[PDB]
XYZ file of C-alpha atoms in Angstrom:
772
model
C 38.689 -10.509 -7.352
C 41.942 -9.113 -5.924
C 44.581 -9.667 -8.474
C 48.011 -9.984 -6.601
C 50.428 -7.306 -8.622
C 53.911 -8.411 -9.044
C 56.774 -6.582 -8.332
C 56.637 -4.763 -11.835
C 53.214 -3.974 -11.663
C 53.411 -2.530 -8.100
C 56.541 -0.463 -9.421
C 54.392 0.813 -12.339
C 51.501 1.358 -9.855
C 53.895 3.514 -7.578
C 54.997 5.645 -10.460
C 51.423 6.370 -11.386
C 50.711 7.191 -7.696
C 53.748 9.381 -7.265
C 52.782 11.507 -10.494
C 49.332 11.819 -9.501
C 50.392 12.761 -5.993
C 52.378 15.707 -7.258
C 49.977 17.201 -9.714
C 46.392 16.830 -8.164
C 44.767 17.914 -4.849
C 44.791 15.035 -2.191
C 40.953 15.180 -2.249
C 40.792 14.494 -6.092
C 38.474 11.866 -7.094
C 39.517 9.350 -9.641
C 36.742 8.952 -12.321
C 36.319 6.571 -15.195
C 33.189 8.393 -16.708
C 33.972 11.739 -18.391
C 30.391 12.710 -17.875
C 31.079 12.665 -14.094
C 34.351 14.727 -14.064
C 34.371 17.568 -11.789
C 36.989 20.295 -11.537
C 40.204 18.634 -9.660
C 39.452 15.142 -10.667
C 41.559 12.583 -12.668
C 40.089 10.864 -15.614
C 41.231 7.472 -15.995
C 40.687 6.562 -19.952
C 40.734 2.652 -20.446
C 38.767 2.533 -23.792
C 37.219 3.452 -30.802
C 37.781 6.956 -29.932
C 39.108 8.098 -26.729
C 38.740 11.612 -27.528
C 35.184 12.175 -27.121
C 35.558 11.721 -23.450
C 39.277 12.956 -22.941
C 38.184 16.373 -24.292
C 35.112 16.274 -22.100
C 37.037 15.573 -18.860
C 39.307 18.306 -19.712
C 36.614 20.643 -20.579
C 34.999 19.758 -17.399
C 38.268 20.376 -15.405
C 40.166 17.112 -15.315
C 43.629 17.878 -13.702
C 45.291 14.886 -15.211
C 44.702 11.909 -17.764
C 45.950 8.245 -17.289
C 45.627 6.323 -20.824
C 46.623 2.896 -21.744
C 49.458 2.843 -24.375
C 48.617 -0.542 -25.849
C 46.095 0.275 -28.691
C 45.328 3.974 -28.013
C 44.694 6.251 -31.091
C 43.811 9.176 -29.116
C 45.945 11.382 -26.854
C 45.513 15.017 -26.388
C 48.258 17.641 -27.511
C 50.157 18.547 -24.397
C 48.175 18.086 -21.276
C 48.932 16.295 -17.919
C 48.713 12.781 -19.664
C 50.379 9.841 -18.180
C 50.984 6.535 -20.017
C 50.245 3.467 -17.785
C 51.097 0.056 -19.011
C 47.971 -2.464 -18.239
C 45.946 0.462 -16.831
C 42.806 -1.775 -16.665
C 44.451 -4.273 -14.408
C 45.809 -1.709 -11.812
C 42.542 0.305 -11.290
C 41.587 -1.356 -8.094
C 44.998 -1.208 -6.581
C 45.409 2.544 -7.688
C 42.061 3.331 -6.524
C 42.793 1.493 -3.029
C 45.985 3.570 -2.600
C 44.514 6.776 -3.990
C 41.883 6.704 -1.382
C 44.163 5.570 1.405
C 43.258 1.982 1.465
C 39.609 2.235 2.626
C 38.988 -1.363 2.910
C 42.095 -1.679 5.065
C 40.358 0.035 7.778
C 36.733 -1.327 7.363
C 35.424 -4.568 8.199
C 33.835 -5.225 4.698
C 31.206 -7.915 4.549
C 30.114 -8.925 0.957
C 26.889 -10.912 0.629
C 25.861 -12.619 -2.346
C 22.869 -14.528 -3.417
C 19.439 -14.407 -5.132
C 17.029 -13.511 -2.271
C 19.201 -12.479 0.424
C 21.648 -9.697 -0.677
C 19.355 -6.701 -0.091
C 17.984 -8.016 3.274
C 21.153 -9.469 4.860
C 23.361 -6.294 3.865
C 20.997 -4.021 5.444
C 20.108 -5.855 8.596
C 23.683 -6.160 9.233
C 24.333 -2.706 8.680
C 21.242 -1.771 10.965
C 22.392 -4.192 13.677
C 26.104 -3.358 13.802
C 25.371 0.347 14.182
C 23.057 -0.384 16.879
C 25.626 -2.635 18.314
C 28.229 0.170 18.392
C 30.257 -0.446 15.136
C 28.787 2.151 12.621
C 28.050 0.285 9.360
C 27.140 1.697 6.078
C 25.447 -0.137 3.266
C 25.855 -0.450 -0.491
C 23.285 -2.160 -2.634
C 19.826 -1.892 -4.473
C 18.920 1.112 -2.276
C 22.262 3.119 -2.875
C 25.284 3.543 -0.425
C 23.817 4.663 2.798
C 25.919 6.228 5.803
C 25.378 4.728 9.179
C 22.791 7.462 9.893
C 20.889 6.660 6.818
C 22.088 9.700 4.601
C 22.208 8.546 0.920
C 25.350 8.880 -0.912
C 29.151 0.675 -9.358
C 32.852 0.571 -11.079
C 36.029 -0.254 -8.967
C 36.745 3.445 -8.474
C 33.406 4.346 -7.022
C 33.507 1.130 -4.613
C 36.697 2.481 -3.023
C 35.768 6.229 -3.200
C 32.399 5.267 -1.280
C 34.308 3.356 1.283
C 36.345 6.415 1.907
C 33.363 8.633 2.275
C 31.963 6.364 4.641
C 35.300 6.050 6.728
C 35.492 9.783 6.715
C 31.731 9.994 8.110
C 32.861 7.596 10.943
C 31.697 4.184 9.654
C 33.836 1.488 10.956
C 32.266 -1.555 9.032
C 30.605 -1.962 5.395
C 27.877 -4.437 4.256
C 27.765 -4.550 0.679
C 25.983 -6.698 -1.955
C 28.133 -8.981 -3.948
C 27.304 -10.695 -7.366
C 29.037 -13.655 -9.262
C 29.059 -11.211 -12.306
C 30.732 -8.470 -10.091
C 33.425 -10.934 -8.935
C 34.206 -12.207 -12.326
C 34.015 -8.501 -14.100
C 36.392 -7.246 -11.183
C 34.278 -4.698 -9.406
C 35.750 -5.710 -5.940
C 39.453 -5.828 -7.060
C 41.665 -4.838 -4.164
C 38.803 -4.703 -1.504
C 39.891 -6.345 1.757
C 36.760 -8.541 2.388
C 36.624 -9.695 5.938
C 33.424 -11.847 5.841
C 31.702 -13.252 2.321
C 27.980 -14.474 3.012
C 26.349 -16.695 0.845
C 22.404 -16.575 0.500
C 21.872 -19.218 -2.259
C 22.797 -20.532 -5.578
C 16.815 -25.297 -10.444
C 17.859 -27.015 -13.421
C 20.895 -24.875 -14.719
C 24.572 -24.403 -14.669
C 25.067 -24.028 -10.942
C 28.533 -25.408 -11.282
C 30.216 -22.349 -12.939
C 28.604 -20.038 -10.289
C 30.047 -22.271 -7.316
C 33.251 -22.849 -9.233
C 33.267 -18.946 -9.683
C 32.627 -18.350 -6.176
C 34.879 -20.999 -4.487
C 37.838 -19.243 -6.392
C 36.748 -16.167 -4.306
C 37.497 -18.097 -1.125
C 41.291 -18.211 -2.230
C 41.459 -14.289 -1.643
C 43.527 -12.485 0.944
C 42.209 -11.352 4.413
C 39.028 -13.398 4.536
C 38.138 -14.163 8.099
C 35.078 -16.289 7.687
C 32.643 -17.638 4.883
C 28.978 -17.771 5.980
C 27.316 -20.070 3.539
C 23.560 -21.502 3.557
C 23.824 -25.130 4.416
C 20.274 -25.757 3.345
C 21.363 -25.323 -0.427
C 22.814 -28.217 -2.298
C 25.345 -26.071 -3.787
C 26.188 -24.438 -0.507
C 26.686 -27.731 1.141
C 29.361 -28.534 -1.518
C 31.175 -25.321 -0.978
C 31.049 -25.704 2.886
C 32.528 -29.213 2.451
C 35.510 -27.911 0.459
C 36.352 -25.052 3.026
C 38.722 -25.354 5.827
C 36.858 -25.480 9.100
C 38.633 -22.509 10.438
C 36.866 -20.309 7.653
C 33.459 -21.754 7.023
C 30.171 -21.081 9.143
C 27.210 -22.963 7.733
C 23.714 -22.064 8.711
C 20.789 -24.175 8.216
C 17.058 -23.939 8.919
C 16.110 -27.444 7.873
C 18.360 -29.326 10.248
C 21.238 -30.251 8.165
C 24.634 -30.364 10.146
C 25.614 -26.816 10.514
C 27.515 -24.354 12.812
C 24.463 -22.220 13.034
C 20.888 -23.561 13.238
C 17.402 -22.354 13.728
C 15.260 -25.098 15.768
C 11.790 -25.321 16.677
C 10.455 -22.632 14.273
C 6.715 -21.940 15.181
C 4.643 -19.025 13.583
C 2.646 -17.300 16.307
C -0.315 -14.777 15.954
C 1.885 -11.851 15.362
C 5.324 -13.449 13.871
C 7.600 -16.425 14.659
C 9.373 -17.920 17.605
C 12.431 -20.257 17.175
C 15.682 -21.122 19.093
C 18.810 -19.697 17.617
C 21.662 -22.227 17.953
C 25.202 -20.789 17.651
C 28.564 -22.747 18.477
C 28.403 -20.726 21.574
C 24.877 -21.218 22.940
C 21.352 -20.974 22.053
C 18.862 -18.356 22.547
C 15.038 -18.075 21.895
C 14.190 -15.345 19.183
C 10.680 -13.930 18.767
C 10.454 -12.094 15.541
C 7.679 -10.362 13.802
C 9.211 -11.524 10.528
C 6.923 -13.928 8.363
C 8.336 -16.777 6.235
C 11.124 -19.145 6.325
C 13.251 -17.226 3.851
C 13.325 -14.453 6.342
C 14.480 -16.970 8.776
C 17.074 -17.989 6.772
C 18.618 -14.570 6.123
C 18.714 -14.002 10.073
C 20.711 -17.231 10.226
C 23.134 -15.729 8.004
C 23.417 -12.310 9.828
C 23.771 -14.373 12.974
C 26.516 -16.534 11.588
C 28.325 -13.427 10.355
C 27.947 -11.546 13.739
C 28.878 -14.794 15.695
C 32.201 -15.235 13.822
C 32.926 -11.501 14.025
C 32.921 -11.975 17.981
C 29.493 -10.751 18.904
C 27.955 -12.512 21.910
C 24.807 -14.584 21.458
C 22.528 -12.532 23.977
C 23.322 -9.411 22.044
C 22.806 -11.108 18.600
C 19.503 -12.525 19.620
C 18.275 -9.467 21.258
C 19.159 -7.344 18.148
C 17.822 -9.821 15.711
C 14.682 -9.960 17.605
C 13.882 -6.265 16.930
C 14.111 -6.198 13.182
C 11.404 -4.772 11.231
C 9.772 -6.215 8.328
C 10.690 -5.012 4.823
C 8.037 -2.720 3.321
C 5.785 -4.765 1.222
C 7.309 -8.148 1.955
C 4.802 -9.745 4.169
C 4.605 -6.543 6.079
C 2.203 -6.413 8.937
C -0.038 -3.374 8.862
C 0.119 -1.552 12.342
C -3.047 -0.054 13.506
C -3.688 3.587 14.559
C -3.149 3.731 18.453
C -6.643 4.089 19.935
C -6.285 5.615 23.407
C -9.482 3.577 24.590
C -7.625 -8.996 12.341
C -3.945 -9.350 11.474
C -3.641 -7.420 8.143
C -0.739 -8.321 5.724
C 0.469 -6.502 2.677
C 2.758 -8.428 -0.056
C 4.010 -7.585 -3.520
C 2.595 -11.116 -4.563
C 1.363 -10.141 -8.224
C 2.507 -13.609 -9.731
C 0.812 -16.966 -9.115
C 4.133 -18.376 -7.633
C 4.575 -15.413 -5.270
C 1.061 -15.530 -4.239
C 1.368 -19.331 -3.405
C 4.339 -18.533 -1.395
C 2.786 -15.594 0.677
C -0.229 -17.883 1.337
C 1.695 -20.741 2.443
C 3.735 -18.452 4.695
C 0.757 -16.918 6.329
C -1.432 -20.453 7.058
C 0.696 -21.394 10.019
C 0.112 -17.568 11.633
C -3.549 -18.390 10.776
C -3.540 -21.551 12.552
C -1.629 -20.085 15.587
C -4.460 -17.293 15.861
C -7.300 -19.920 15.167
C -8.784 -17.795 12.464
C -9.346 -18.204 8.572
C -6.727 -17.017 5.847
C -8.479 -14.336 3.767
C -6.775 -13.350 0.376
C -7.469 -10.038 -1.509
C -5.874 -9.694 -4.713
C -6.348 -8.534 -8.090
C -4.544 -8.886 -11.420
C -3.256 -6.278 -13.779
C -4.858 -5.467 -17.053
C -2.681 -5.479 -20.420
C -0.125 -7.844 -18.706
C -0.162 -11.727 -18.777
C -3.515 -12.737 -19.116
C -2.293 -16.251 -18.196
C -1.679 -15.422 -14.696
C -5.475 -14.655 -13.922
C -7.168 -17.794 -13.797
C -4.132 -19.554 -12.301
C -3.964 -17.073 -9.377
C -7.608 -17.371 -8.603
C -7.100 -21.051 -8.333
C -3.899 -20.717 -5.987
C -5.792 -18.300 -3.782
C -8.816 -20.473 -3.492
C -6.754 -23.587 -3.175
C -4.667 -22.023 -0.505
C -6.902 -19.562 1.322
C -10.058 -19.982 3.328
C -11.669 -16.791 1.974
C -10.766 -15.132 -1.500
C -11.856 -11.719 -2.496
C -10.963 -10.885 -5.926
C -10.575 -7.102 -6.900
C -9.134 -4.604 -9.212
C -5.187 -4.244 -9.337
C -4.022 -1.522 -11.697
C -6.664 -2.330 -14.538
C -5.393 0.519 -16.360
C -7.233 0.726 -19.748
C -8.826 -2.769 -19.597
C -12.236 -3.441 -18.248
C -11.876 -4.239 -14.361
C -14.965 -6.717 -14.803
C -13.391 -8.635 -17.785
C -10.117 -9.306 -15.439
C -12.335 -10.496 -12.758
C -14.380 -12.829 -14.821
C -11.158 -14.331 -16.085
C -9.744 -14.740 -12.529
C -12.917 -16.236 -11.389
C -12.846 -18.793 -14.351
C -9.702 -20.361 -12.673
C -11.612 -21.263 -9.539
C -12.636 -24.858 -9.497
C -16.385 -25.530 -9.513
C -17.495 -25.858 -5.857
C -15.397 -22.927 -4.359
C -16.522 -19.486 -4.479
C -14.696 -16.047 -4.393
C -16.395 -12.769 -3.384
C -16.135 -9.879 -5.950
C -15.690 -6.133 -5.155
C -14.242 -4.161 -7.986
C -13.376 -1.091 -5.941
C -10.171 -2.181 -4.117
C -10.698 0.426 -1.439
C -14.216 -1.117 -1.005
C -12.948 -4.774 -1.069
C -10.341 -3.872 1.819
C -12.728 -2.038 3.988
C -15.486 -4.860 3.488
C -13.120 -7.712 4.020
C -11.729 -6.097 7.208
C -14.699 -5.086 8.548
C -16.477 -8.553 8.078
C -13.323 -10.487 9.388
C -13.119 -11.980 12.930
C -10.287 -10.880 15.097
C -8.560 -14.073 14.443
C -8.456 -13.990 10.800
C -5.282 -13.404 8.878
C -5.962 -11.130 5.910
C -3.364 -10.931 3.063
C -3.605 -7.990 0.971
C -1.667 -9.187 -2.065
C -0.292 -7.563 -5.218
C 0.793 -3.935 -4.531
C 3.114 -4.391 -1.651
C 5.393 -1.290 -1.711
C 3.519 0.338 -4.464
C 1.473 3.464 -3.638
C -0.767 4.113 -6.722
C -3.461 2.447 -8.419
C -3.362 2.843 -12.296
C -6.803 3.319 -13.674
C -7.439 4.548 -17.270
C -3.766 5.614 -17.460
C -3.772 7.743 -14.345
C -1.811 6.621 -11.457
C -3.914 7.506 -8.494
C -2.748 7.429 -4.793
C -3.632 4.194 -3.423
C -1.601 2.604 -0.299
C -3.011 -0.962 0.954
C -1.550 -0.019 4.187
C -3.287 3.370 4.581
C -6.658 1.731 3.751
C -5.984 -1.152 6.130
C -5.264 1.457 8.917
C -8.354 3.314 7.941
C -10.426 0.022 8.279
C -9.044 -0.967 11.555
C -9.644 2.406 13.015
C -13.054 3.473 11.677
C -15.225 0.945 13.623
C -13.803 2.437 16.781
C -14.049 6.086 16.134
C -16.657 8.194 17.792
C -18.069 10.265 14.537
C -16.737 11.415 11.357
C -16.179 15.295 11.087
C -15.038 17.460 7.954
C -15.280 20.714 10.159
C -12.679 21.715 12.519
C -14.859 24.121 14.284
C -17.198 21.135 15.331
C -14.735 18.233 15.592
C -14.958 16.471 19.080
C -12.784 14.250 21.033
C -12.146 10.743 19.358
C -13.473 11.669 15.955
C -11.976 11.373 12.611
C -11.052 14.458 10.796
C -11.376 14.593 7.126
C -9.217 17.258 5.580
C -11.143 18.561 2.563
C -9.425 20.351 -0.301
C -11.604 23.042 -1.611
C -13.544 26.571 -1.469
C -11.292 29.218 -0.223
C -9.390 27.653 2.816
C -8.072 24.195 2.107
C -8.769 21.920 5.129
C -5.269 20.556 5.297
C -4.416 23.978 6.954
C -6.135 22.936 9.983
C -4.621 19.815 11.089
C -3.076 21.289 14.117
C -6.471 22.618 15.349
C -7.925 19.152 14.796
C -5.069 17.811 16.871
C -5.565 20.337 19.537
C -9.437 19.275 19.606
C -8.649 15.746 20.162
C -9.342 14.183 16.864
C -8.220 10.617 17.025
C -6.845 10.452 13.278
C -7.133 12.678 10.162
C -7.837 11.361 6.404
C -5.470 13.641 4.451
C -4.529 13.896 0.631
C -0.701 14.381 1.451
C 1.247 14.294 4.571
C 2.161 17.508 6.583
C 5.331 17.814 8.537
C 5.255 18.729 12.166
C 1.749 17.732 12.919
C 1.523 14.660 15.319
C -1.805 14.010 14.362
C -1.792 10.613 12.773
C -2.489 10.995 9.009
C -4.152 8.400 6.938
C -3.124 9.337 3.349
C -5.907 8.122 1.080
C -5.393 10.476 -1.797
C -8.629 12.521 -3.052
C -10.334 12.938 0.442
C -13.615 13.461 -1.224
C -13.500 10.381 -3.223
C -12.149 8.491 -0.168
C -15.018 9.773 1.925
C -17.581 8.633 -0.721
C -15.800 4.942 -0.462
C -15.811 5.081 3.107
C -19.625 6.119 3.164
C -20.347 3.159 0.597
C -18.485 0.685 2.448
C -20.014 1.521 5.867
C -23.655 1.454 4.500
C -23.044 -2.013 3.007
C -22.182 -3.215 6.443
C -26.019 -3.160 7.621
C -29.330 -4.749 6.623
C -32.107 -2.170 7.086
C -34.755 -0.293 5.367
C -33.191 2.814 3.824
C -35.527 5.627 2.403
C -33.750 8.006 0.067
C -35.571 11.067 -0.738
C -35.119 13.189 -4.048
C -36.965 15.825 -6.034
C -37.204 19.436 -7.037
C -38.847 20.662 -4.134
C -40.089 19.452 -0.639
C -37.299 16.943 -0.069
C -36.167 18.432 3.456
C -39.786 18.735 4.647
C -40.774 15.421 3.254
C -37.629 13.887 4.782
C -38.437 15.294 8.213
C -41.785 13.857 7.896
C -40.394 10.475 7.146
C -37.924 10.767 10.106
C -41.007 11.533 12.162
C -42.688 8.353 11.229
C -39.567 6.203 11.718
C -39.168 7.651 15.309
C -42.782 6.724 15.851
C -42.091 3.170 14.494
C -38.830 2.399 15.779
C -38.149 4.799 18.462
C -35.873 7.769 18.386
C -32.816 5.915 19.047
C -33.657 3.307 15.936
C -33.609 5.906 13.307
C -31.036 7.591 11.388
C -32.039 10.808 9.331
C -30.136 13.222 7.370
C -29.273 16.402 9.692
C -29.748 19.783 8.198
C -28.464 20.316 4.563
C -26.025 17.207 4.427
C -27.425 16.084 1.030
C -24.373 16.489 -1.134
C -21.353 14.514 -2.212
C -19.660 15.368 1.245
C -22.913 15.491 3.556
C -24.347 12.399 2.294
C -21.250 10.161 3.093
C -20.994 11.806 6.408
C -24.358 10.964 7.206
C -24.044 7.406 6.167
C -21.014 6.937 8.702
C -23.156 7.492 11.651
C -25.135 4.322 11.052
C -24.614 1.943 14.183
C -26.251 -1.292 15.121
C -29.126 0.089 16.946
C -30.588 1.539 13.814
C -33.453 -0.183 12.510
C -34.635 2.320 9.680
C -32.829 5.064 8.012
C -34.062 8.110 5.674
C -31.489 9.937 3.451
C -32.171 13.076 1.665
C -30.294 13.233 -1.669
C -29.578 16.514 -3.308
C -28.149 17.330 -6.887
C -26.333 20.275 -8.572
C -24.638 18.661 -11.396
C -25.406 15.659 -13.811
C -24.567 12.435 -12.207
C -24.661 13.346 -8.652
C -28.084 11.523 -7.949
C -26.582 8.393 -9.449
C -23.310 8.539 -7.376
C -25.273 9.429 -4.134
C -28.275 6.961 -4.608
C -25.444 4.150 -5.371
C -23.768 5.120 -2.230
C -26.856 5.209 0.092
C -28.127 1.899 -1.352
C -31.728 2.512 -0.608
C -34.678 -0.088 -0.486
C -37.268 2.667 -0.886
C -36.554 5.544 -3.606
C -38.858 8.640 -3.399
C -38.990 11.095 -6.147
C -40.845 14.141 -4.354
C -41.606 15.958 -7.759
C -40.188 17.181 -11.114
C -40.020 20.903 -11.603
C -37.495 22.734 -13.906
C -31.938 25.992 -13.169
C -30.860 25.004 -16.605
C -27.164 24.077 -15.626
C -27.871 20.773 -17.479
C -33.279 22.086 -18.704
C -36.513 20.330 -19.461
C -38.616 18.822 -16.706
C -38.606 15.478 -18.583
C -34.656 15.604 -18.217
C -35.218 16.663 -14.378
C -37.336 13.377 -14.164
C -34.652 11.119 -15.545
C -31.894 12.764 -13.419
C -34.119 12.405 -9.887
C -35.369 9.041 -11.039
C -32.074 7.710 -10.923
C -32.498 6.900 -7.361
C -35.283 4.521 -8.627
C -32.481 2.836 -10.529
C -30.458 2.167 -7.457
C -33.120 -0.023 -5.950
C -32.624 -3.841 -5.624
C -34.975 -6.122 -7.358
C -37.193 -6.218 -4.426
C -37.313 -2.445 -3.850
C -40.261 -0.058 -3.955
C -40.298 2.990 -6.037
C -42.352 6.012 -4.828
C -43.094 8.913 -7.328
C -46.087 11.406 -7.736
C -48.675 9.393 -9.846
C -50.822 12.409 -10.883
C -48.095 14.332 -12.770
C -47.584 14.456 -16.704
C -44.239 12.709 -16.347
C -44.945 9.644 -14.407
C -44.266 7.348 -17.456
C -40.749 8.196 -17.171
C -40.511 6.981 -13.499
C -42.924 4.082 -14.346
C -40.593 2.676 -16.905
C -37.386 3.231 -14.849
C -39.075 1.371 -11.846
C -39.478 -1.547 -14.293
C -40.787 -4.820 -12.215
C -40.278 -3.226 -8.795
C -43.173 -2.779 -6.555
C -44.443 0.911 -7.072
C -46.577 3.069 -4.794
C -47.767 6.190 -6.693
C -49.152 9.121 -4.714
C -50.907 12.449 -5.438
C -54.324 14.035 -5.188
C -56.292 12.103 -7.744
C -58.356 9.090 -6.875
C -57.289 5.695 -8.121
C -53.575 6.190 -7.168
C -51.992 3.870 -4.522
C -51.694 6.776 -1.753
C -54.110 9.547 -2.349
C -56.082 12.072 -0.316
C -59.828 12.390 -0.147
C -62.155 14.941 1.507
C -59.659 17.675 1.573
C -60.289 20.555 3.762
C -57.525 23.334 3.624
C -57.435 26.016 6.383
C -54.885 28.606 7.401
C -52.990 26.456 9.756
C -53.291 22.834 8.224
C -55.106 20.267 6.061
C -57.653 17.671 7.168
C -58.352 14.729 4.733
C -58.900 11.191 4.480
C -55.897 9.342 3.296
C -56.337 6.154 1.088
C -53.434 3.717 1.008
C -53.051 -0.091 0.256
C -53.146 -0.669 3.816
C -56.141 1.037 4.509
C -57.948 4.419 4.919
C -57.506 6.808 7.801
C -58.474 10.385 8.660
C -55.487 12.932 8.798
C -55.459 16.388 10.467
C -52.087 17.448 9.195
C -50.981 20.514 11.332
C -48.943 21.966 8.470
C -51.007 24.034 6.032
C -50.849 24.097 2.196
C -51.532 21.737 -0.540
C -47.621 21.216 -1.235
C -47.210 19.972 2.484
C -50.267 17.397 1.987
C -48.377 16.080 -0.836
C -45.269 15.917 1.307
C -47.335 14.057 4.033
C -48.900 11.571 1.409
C -45.105 10.848 0.106
C -44.112 10.089 3.790
C -47.002 7.958 4.312
C -46.123 5.850 1.108
C -42.520 5.727 2.291
C -43.580 4.604 5.612
C -45.617 1.951 4.526
C -42.963 0.680 1.910
C -40.277 0.598 4.604
C -42.670 -1.363 6.981
C -44.142 1.145 9.154
C -48.157 0.188 10.069
C -50.522 2.597 8.832
C -51.741 3.639 12.157
C -48.126 4.726 13.122
C -47.690 6.836 9.964
C -50.969 8.652 10.544
C -50.086 9.188 14.275
C -46.739 10.605 13.499
C -47.805 13.039 10.801
C -50.967 14.018 12.861
C -48.515 15.062 15.357
C -45.735 16.619 13.147
C -43.963 20.056 13.756
C -42.334 21.972 11.431
């Protein structure tokens, strides 16, 4: 609020300036906060005890003190103290003169409003710099130079302008506020253009009246006012035509208009109409509020003298603000539209979905909303958001969103309670799984909204903020269906494969990203970025945990018999026998089997990621070293047939009974219609019998009366001949591998082959022909 100093105040100012100019360096900064004083600065003390600050400024090297003479019960004994009458009222002029009148040489654009200060000031700074007038910005993100380097009371304002000018800035866009204008944060700033974004049942009048007083300030060239807002319309009506530029999205008579706004599959198309012509603009920004902001930017630029083709061209190239209906850009591959928004309240979610519907219509696809609600926050939003999502989106997936210390399922159940009877939402509590599964089942024309986190890069689970970025997971989901193979070993990684940078052992896989790049990897999953490596990096945090979720999600996209093999001994031999059966049953190309020793928390998800549409049956070997591994691996593999080969007691965690329960967990992962296969002639069958519950059970062994057992056993040095008795019939078997343990492995394979759907004759033929 530039106060016009009368002749006496100007004289008083000149006295203060002449004194300051005589006793401190021309580079001295004027500071009001004694804590920020650096040697050579001037402390301006305008306070009930000034001494706790005046002494500090002197202790910190202040070269002079300006103090107000009305009411001060502080003054140091004998320093460079200057009494200044009305010091508070002169600070703007003092700062303006001390820093060489920085606003006199800058085109200062001050933008105010509720939802356009940050966007408009930054886009103006971006566009003007690209148009050849280097423009700095001041606002929520700090004071930035035209080149983006990061650098507020009235002295700081003038000081910041001075630094920008010294760095070559010729214009400054700054966020203004009604409070700032009233409180005097802008005093003696020469404002060239003031922009108004917007001004609801309240006292709008004081805000408008406060702002209109602003427009009878000196050196204003133009006022850019939103004509779509009722308060804005009244302000425009009161301003002389020469100063006012109105903009309107909805067709109110204004100088600047957007017409024919149409959402496209990747953005919006509208005709920008300025007094001096019209131009079609194709932009990737989503939402009418973003269009309104461009009109403010366009109006300011048009009144500042920039021609329409250049305005249209530059406005057309603006990038969406992170986390505000930001479209996720897929990883470029040499050979669905996913949108992320910080919609974590009911109203915000509704607006985002409303904003995305015309885009979905332009694409001919469904609007899919993936969202969760935070725990230990406002429970009242959870049912409401469920209703909004299902009322306004075509498909809704409810997932966890920073559940913190609450149970994720309880939050989901509360959300679902708000979804009207007859509408359904899918539930996937693991947000990473929700993203991958939703994106992989979506048609290319669908619009998927990942709502909630926006710019947030963590998930808070149980008090730990774990790295999680909706954008990175969407990028992974878009890449993975097209990647050749997933590899964790740079010695073996091929062209077009995804490299997983594992952290562990002796040599942290992150150190080998240049090699992966040289080997032609298509992307790398990494825990943290790495500078100067051009290989696209998907930052997914814990790469081992990410890999498990990747494997789990990929497995969930296929419906086929899956044999999970676990046990103390014979897993690999049995798995190979089962693999032989599947090859005999479905063909070599229709089967997937664990290769080598890929049976741990790394190998198993890597094997899962090899599943393709051609496979018709799969066998996975599951290995264990620590408690909980079988549960984790079996849950990941989601088997339809679970085999326990045997229970034999290493005491890392020690009884055979304890081993039976751990290995038995694969049976716990079976669906209701799954088949449990375990040895029936061992003393511990009861543990596995109970765990199997009501599921179909095939018990195998050497005792008559089991479901799959051998009779007439003839063991020779090189193999075993026997009659095999199964529920599907009886057949002779010449098993070309010696030993009773191998015969048991063969019986397990027959039981698993039969449970998976292979005909008995196929099982026998495969095993009769089996090679070690």
